[PDB]
Fold this sequence. Notes:
The structure holds two protein chains of two kinds. Chain A has one helix at about 5. Chain A is an all-alpha fold.
Amino acid sequence: GIVEQCCASVCSLYQLENYCN
Amino acid sequence: FVNQHLCGSHLVEALYLVCGERGFFYTPKA
Lengths: 21, 30
């Protein structure tokens, strides 16, 4: 349950990998 | 009230400051 922690929507974990390893 | 959306995604994006270094290797933002 990490997606809800960031935002209720419009937020994916796949976004962190874009700039960091 | 100032109109500006802020969330974890915004915090997550802000990572480009420390991330996206790739050292001296330059590549399209992707």
